[PDB]
Structures are given as C-alpha cells and as structure tokens.
Amino acid sequence: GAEKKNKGRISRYLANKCSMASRIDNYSEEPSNVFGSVLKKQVEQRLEFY
Amino acid sequence: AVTIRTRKVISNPLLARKQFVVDVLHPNRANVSKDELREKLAEVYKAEKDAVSVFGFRTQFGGGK
Amino acid sequence: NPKAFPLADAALTQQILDVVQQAANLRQLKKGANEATKTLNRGISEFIIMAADCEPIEILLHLPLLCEDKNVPYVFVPSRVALGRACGVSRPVIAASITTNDASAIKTQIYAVKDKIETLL
Amino acid sequence: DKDIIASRLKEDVAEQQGRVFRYFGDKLLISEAKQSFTRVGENNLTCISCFQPVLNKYTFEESSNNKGRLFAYTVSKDLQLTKYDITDFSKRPKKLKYAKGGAKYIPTSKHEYENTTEGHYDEILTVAASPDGKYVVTGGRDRKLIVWSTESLSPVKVIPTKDRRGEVLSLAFRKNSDQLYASCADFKIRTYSINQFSQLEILYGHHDIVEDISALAMERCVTVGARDRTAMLWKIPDETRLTFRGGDEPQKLLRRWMKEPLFFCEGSIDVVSMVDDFHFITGSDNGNICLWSLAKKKPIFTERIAHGILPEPSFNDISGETDEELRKRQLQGKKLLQPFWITSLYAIPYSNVFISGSWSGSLKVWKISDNLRSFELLGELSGAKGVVTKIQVVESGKHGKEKFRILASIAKEHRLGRWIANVSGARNGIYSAVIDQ
Amino acid sequence: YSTPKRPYESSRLDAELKLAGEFGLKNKKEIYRISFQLSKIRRAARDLLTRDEKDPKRLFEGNALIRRLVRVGVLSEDKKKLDYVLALKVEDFLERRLQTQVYKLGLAKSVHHARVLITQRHIAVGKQIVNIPSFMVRLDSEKHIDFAPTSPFGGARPGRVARRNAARKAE
RNA sequence: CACUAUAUUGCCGUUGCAUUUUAUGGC
C-alpha cells in the first residue's frame, strides 16, 4: 500500500534509505532532523533521472 | 622467448678455460637445442661457437628451466 | 564508553584486518551493514567488524543489539577506508562478517582473533 | 685539471659503481619554486611517466629518436593516455596526442589468453616510457599490457598477462635498457623484453598484491606487496630474493618514548623507490617512510607519520544527535585519527633527495644525510591540492648546475580504489614545479 | 609404512573409513605412513619431557622440534611448548597435505576433484608444478597455491578437448 | 629522413588585453 522498473528501483532506494533513517533515529538517544534532510535530498537527486 | 643465464663463472687458466653452471629458461619450448644454445652462448661471450662447449644438461620437473 | 565501545587498538586492528583480507580472498566474508545483519540472523557469522567513523554511527550501531543477542563477538575499527582496502573492494565498507565454515583454511587464525576480541570484551 | 678528472669520473663511472653520488641536498633551494598547476579534465588521471633523452648513451651518438626534446606520458581512469611536451621549462606541459579505449575493445572469445584487441577494456592503471624513446608500455586492470609507439601512439603489440586475475599494477623499466618489470596482482612479477616483444621470466614468491615496483641500472627489482608488511628485493641473474620486513610495534615505540605522542601500527607497505643499488625507501599505510639497505632487515631510518594525520569528522556528521556534548564524545578524542597514508614516492636515482606525496595538498621533499642512515625535510610544495598518483622528476642544465621539473599527477581519488575522506577541492591535473640551482 | 599391532578391529576400521572418506585418500597405507611418522615424532617428543627441564639437550632439541612443527603448521604458535607436541594427532598431519589444503583454498569444490586436478599437473606451489597429493605445504607456502602457468585452468592454451571441439565446431 | 606543405580544462565560475592573457573553486 505505501511507498508511492522505473518505480521498482526507486522503491528499493527509498526502502533502504528509510531503513537507514530508522536506524539513525532509533539508536540516537535524542534524534536530530539534519540527517533526514540529507537523506531526502539524496533520494530526490536519485529520482531526478526521470 | 628463452633466456640463457650463467652462474658461478670461475676461470681456470690451468686449461685456459672458463667454466660455469648455465641455466636456460625456456617458458614454452621443449628444449633449447644444444648447438643453438651453445652458439648463442658464444655470442654472449667473446667468440667461437667451436670453442665453447656445454655438456651437462637436464630439464627440471614441470618444465620451464 | 561512548557508543561504539569495543574499539580495537592498533595491533589488534591490524591483525583483524589481515584476517578480513584473507577471508575475503577465500570468499568467506560478507560485507556491508544489511548483508551483515542478514547473515547474522541466518546464523552463520563468526564475528563481525564495524568501522566506527561512519556517517553517522547508528547505521551500524543497530548491529550490537542483534549480535550480542545471538552471542557472536563484535569489534570496532577506526576507519571505513581501511576496512574497504582490507576487504579488497573499491568503496569504503563499514560492516563485515565472517561466515562460519569448517572447510576454511583460516580457521585457527579466525579462532585466535576471536579469543583476543572476546578477552577485549 | 683535477676538476675535469672528477667530472669525467662522475660522468658514468660513479653510476656504474652504483652508489649515491649526485649530491645536491643543501645545494638545492626549495622555498621559491615555480609551482604551476595544470588542469586536465579527464576523470582521475592515474600515472605520469616522463622520458628525457640521455645524451651520449655511455659511448657517444647523443640519443635515440625530433632531436633533443623531453616528454611525459599520462593515464586517465576513463581510458585515455596523453602525451605531453615538457621540454620548455617554465612553461606549461602542452598536450600533444591522445588515445582512448572504449567498449569496442572487448573481445568475443572472452575466456582465454587472447586479449588481442588493441585498446582497453577498462581502468587503465599505469604507464612507463622506454628510455630509448621508441615505445611506452601501458597496463591496467584489464589484464593486458600494450606497447604504444612514442610518435603516433599506435598499438604496436598487446601483451596479455594470461591470467584470471593478473591486473598489472605498476611497471618499471630497467634504466638504459628495454627490460620491463611489471607487477601483477596475482602475487607475481613479470619480465618483458620490449624489442623482442616477449616475456623473459615470471618470478613468484611474494605473498599478496605486489602493488609497487622500482628498478635501476643493474638487474634489481624492489617490490612491495600490501597486506604482508614486507618488501622483496629481487636479484635476477642469480635468481634469488631478500625479504625485508617491518617490525615497529607501538608498545615498543612507547618504551622508546616513556623516558620523558600518538603513533599506531602498520597496515600495509604501499610505495617504493630505490635511491641506488644499495638503499631503497618505501612508504607504508601508516604514513611511515622507511629507508632500508641491502644488509639489514629492520629499517635503518623510519620517519614517522609523514604527511600528518587526517582531520577528524565534525560534530555534524558523526552521530546525528542534537547535543554537542554527546556529539563531542562520539569523536572519541584522538583515538580514531588515521594518518595520511602516502600514495606515491619517488627518489631521483643516485641522488641526495627524494619526494613523497599523498592527499595533504602538498608534496614533501626530503634529503638523505651524508652517512646514508638518516634523512630529513627540505621544504614543502603546495599547489598539488589532491591525491598524488605518481611523481616523476626531469632535469636539465650543466654538469653541476641543475634545473628540475617535478611532475606529480594529481587526481581526486586513489589510483586503485575510490576511498576518499572528503577530499577538498582536488582538480584532476599535473603539478609541475621548476626548481633550480 | 608400518603395520598396526591388531589391525582388524572394527574401531580401527571405522577410523580408517572416516579419515579416508573425509580427506580423500586411496587406501589405508597413507594413514599408516603419516601415523608412523606421527608416532616417531611424539615418541621422540616424550623422552625429552621425561628428562629434566633446562637440560640443554631438552632445551635445544625441543626448540628444534617445535620450530619444525610450527613451520609445517601442525602446531600453532600460541602453543610453543613440548607437551603440545604430545597433544598433537594425525588429522592435523593430513590436514596439511596439498590435496586437502587446496580444497580448503577453494578452486577445487571437492576433495577428490582436488586430488585429481593435482594429479593432472594443474597446480603449482609458487613456481614448481606438483603432481602428488601427500605434500605437506608449509605455513609460508600456504598462500602460494594457484594453477600452473602451463595449464588451461591457468593461462595457457585451451586443452585437448577444447581445441578438438572448437575444430569440430569450425566444421 | 627528404619533400609536398596544407592557414590550462569534459563541463561550470575568470585576471586580463593595446583577440589572447592568466589561477584559482563546483560536478
């Protein structure tokens, strides 16, 4: 249902990016937002091939 | 392409003769053709194929040298 | 005790990195964080190595909570590019895991490394 | 007079004696070189091999074929070697000729020895230009090596390594000859004759990837493999070797310091050059620079962390917390500092001097002592912002007065892997320093 | 070779079956050969234990013996005392032979394929082509094993079947 | 070899001409 070929590989990219983001904001004891922002910029620069 | 090297070059003017242990490295040939290698040995030395003489050969196991 | 606690000193770092290199050449090493946790919950993992200068640190710090649960030893090293060069691969790895195998030729070196890091912890 | 007798001895009899004679340590000012950078946009340049024609090659009949101009050859990582004129000193190295390699140089047998296709598959690593100036050999991760003509750069012949994993990692010419010692990463060293276009002998006995090689006039080779902390010196005409190991452990270095300060163990030997036929210098993975002889196993003189230590990461990209105290503690002090492990090193043959390079932005020049058991700084060459893949020195002037041109190929990643730690503004190009007197 | 005292025990028969099976051997004579040299090596190791400590005979010949066994690799360098030579056993001796060692090194995918491509003269230890299984590679020459230069698994010409079938496909 | 003689960089930001010139920093 969620995580909205050319859609499949960007779904996988978003999947392991958000798993990594989950690791960050879980094990950091009091999390920040800046790494989420740079992950967002990474995945948008990745999908900007289209 | 082969490469012939010599080693333990000791002179012997008791026979006016320069003796050594020669080792040839042929990476893909079968053997080094005693006449052909002795004339190449005379070429890398001063002269005289007829006065150079190499005699004690054996090819080691697995080939190559 | 900051976050990546069992950080190896120089000599133990170097011997675990050389056993990493011969494991990678023997094809007994699985590299990267998610392949590491995949072999960790497969159960074939002798000990795991993590580079404690990654960007940031939590991306592999998820691995102690699995590995000390499943009773395998875990070491930190000081450099991702050192671990990448020691894995024999072009990009910097941050996590690496030695698959258990009884047909290995590196078994005694693996066990000596394991004993040193378990006495480290 | 006596000075002309001395100059005639120092013509060649000193170099056939094979000891360090060309002393210009203190004679060489450093701190005012003409330190010109040249940008070349071809995607991580990985090698430099200059070629100067030697006059009157041990008899007469000045040189070999223009008449008397120098050269340099260089190698990209996107499969392009380029031929530069360097002969006009205090001028930029001008690009002359070009040769690329595409996907069409992949063969179709693909599973045997035959890599007869003339160009390159991928990832050309390093060159060496022959001292008779007819050919330049090239070789990279595509298990070939090519002889290019030095004029039209036409594939004279292609030499396959005949191996599943024989990536060629460094080539070296025995000087004033055309025997070629290639250092193939299946733990072996190959020898080739260029004029015969063939392979004389392959020589085994190393222990890991033989990633750097050096050679000089006589039939020596000095190679280092990486993850075995050793250095093999091959003497060919008796077919034997000499294994010089490291052996500097940090606890004993702490014993040597504790009379009255951080240092760490040795990852890997990386780079070599040999200053004569009796001493050579290596550069390791802990920044250590070793000066070594024929007769001993331990280092004669090992300079410590040479190019300094890499800067630690910031607060902002270590943990992703919010509080600066916890992101301070996540740095763990100085404990995860790792050195500038050096990437290229070159000694001018039989000279008082050598040079070392990594990605500290700056070449470091060093002078051996007179008693040949120590060495020290001479200066600093800061225009080479980036990783140094290979340094080569070319010279000019009189019998006593010298005019040097240092050519250091600069890329923005290491010539084997990728392995950066935020390299800050590295232009792919050539550092070129004119330094005189 | 050396024959056992009571050879026809079912325990010894299952012993020879297991060792020959999981190490790829050809009869019981290989087991008996290396068991005989193991027996003489620890029978020469135990009387040095029974004599006095710091007897220079014991000191020098014990350091000689363990310097040999570390270099063969049956004795790890963490156990550099003479009673570990007593604790040594025969599977450590046939672990170091070239057949089992190349199968542990990879490139062979089964122990008997390791034996048969050794015997096809395909494998050279560094420089020298070796066509015998029972070789006992030393700890330095462990990492020197790859295919021969004059072998189609190395980098030589393709073999007889390969070029014959290539000619018949040219037809 | 003799001829015939044909007449700084992959991209982006620059000193500076009486067009070159010139060394920096983004992929």
According to DSSP H, which parts of chain C are helical? 10-25, 33-42, 58-61, 63-67, 80-87, 107-120
Is E144–D204 a contact, with Cβ atoms under 8 angstroms apart?
yes
- CA–CA gap between residue D283 and residue C30 (Å, rounded): 30
- CA–CA gap between residue E38 and residue E95 (Å, rounded): 13
C115: Cβ–Cβ under 8 A, 6 or more apart, which residues?
A: none
Q: How far is CA B2 from the centre of its chain?
A: 12
If you search the block for the tokens 């023997």, which residue do you land on?
C26
Residue of C nearest to E92 (CA): C108
Distance of residue E4 Cα from the nearest chain D Cα, in angstroms: 41
DSSP E126: T
- CA–CA gap between residue B48 and residue D326 (Å, rounded): 85
Contact status of B59 with chain E (Cβ, < 8 Å) = no
Interface of E with D (CB under 8 A): 126-127, 143-144, 146, 149, 154-158
Q: Is D393 helix (H, G, I), strand (E, B) or coil?
A: strand
Which of chain C's residues have a Cβ under 8 Å away from the Cβ of E78?
112
The contacts found for E154-163 with CB under 8 angstroms, 24 or more apart, are E154/D162, E154/D163, E154/E122, E155/D113, E155/D160, E155/D161, E155/D162, E155/D163, E155/D164, E155/D166, E156/D113, E156/D162, E157/D113, E158/D112
D79: left (phi over 0), alpha (psi -120 to 50) or beta: left
Between the alpha carbon of residue D55 and those of residues D3, D60, D67, E51, the distances in Å are 21, 8, 11, 74
DSSP-assigned states of every residue in D286-314: SS-EEEEESS-SS-SEEE-SSS-BPPPP-
B41's tokens? 């040995």
Experimental structure resolution, Å: 3.8
Q: Which of D329, D416, D418 sits opposite C2 (nearest CB)?
A: D329
Do E58 and E48 contact (CB within 8 A), yes or no?
Answer: yes
- CA–CA gap between residue D168 and residue D189 (Å, rounded): 9
Do D342 and C14 contact (CB within 8 A), yes or no?
Answer: no
Task: Residue C102: give its domain's CATH number.
Answer: 3.30.1330.30
Beta bridge pairs of residue D158: D146
Q: Do chains C and B touch (3 or more CB pairs under 8 A)?
A: no
Contact status of B30 with chain E (Cβ, < 8 Å) = no
Q: Which of B27, B28, B62 sits opposite E128 (nearest CB)?
A: B62
Q: How many CA atoms lie less than 13 Å away from B45 in the CB half-sphere?
A: 23
Q: How far is CA E61 from the centre of its chain?
A: 24
D344's tokens? 């290229």
**CA→C1' distance for D40 and F4 (Å):** 35
Residue of A nearest to C63 (CA): A23
Is D323–A35 a contact, with Cβ atoms under 8 angstroms apart?
no
What is the span of the domain harbouring residue C75?
1-121
Q: How far is CA E53 from the centre of its chain?
A: 32
Neighbour tally for E133: CB within 10 Å: 23
Which of chain E's residues have a Cβ under 8 Å away from the Cβ of C88?
none
Rounded (10°) angle between helices E28-50 and E56-72: 150
Q: In this complex, which chains have at least 3 CB pairs below 8 Å with chain D? A: A, B, C, E
Is E155–D187 a contact, with Cβ atoms under 8 angstroms apart?
no
Q: Using CA of residue C34, residue C40, residue C41, residue C42, what is the dihedral sign? A: positive
Residue type, C57: I
What are residue C9's phi and psi, to 5 degrees? -80, -170
A41's tokens? 């910029």
Do D231 and D282 contact (CB within 8 A), yes or no?
Answer: yes
D381's tokens? 């060459």
Contact status of A16 with chain C (Cβ, < 8 Å) = yes
A36's tokens? 């989420």
- CA–CA gap between residue E120 and residue D400 (Å, rounded): 63
Q: Which of D113, D186, D207 sits opposite E146 (nearest CB)?
A: D186
Which nucleotides of strand F lie under 7 Å from a protein CB?
A: 1, 8-11, 23-27
Q: Which of B27, B28, B62 sits opposite E124 (nearest CB)?
A: B62
Q: Domain spans of chain E?
A: 7-171
D300 burial type by CB count under 10 A (0-12 exposed, 13-18 middle, 19+ buried)? middle
A40: Cβ–Cβ under 8 A, 6 or more apart, which residues?
A: none
Q: How was this structure determined?
A: cryo-EM
Among D422, A13, E142, residue whose Cα is nearest residue C80: D422
- CA–CA gap between residue D341 and residue D312 (Å, rounded): 15
Which of chain C's residues have a Cβ under 8 Å away from the Cβ of D319?
3, 56-58
D28's tokens? 């060489």
What are residue D363's phi and psi, to 5 degrees? -75, 150
Which of chain C's residues have a Cβ under 8 Å away from the Cβ of E142?
105
Contact status of B23 with chain E (Cβ, < 8 Å) = no
Q: Is E130 helix (H, G, I), strand (E, B) or coil?
A: coil
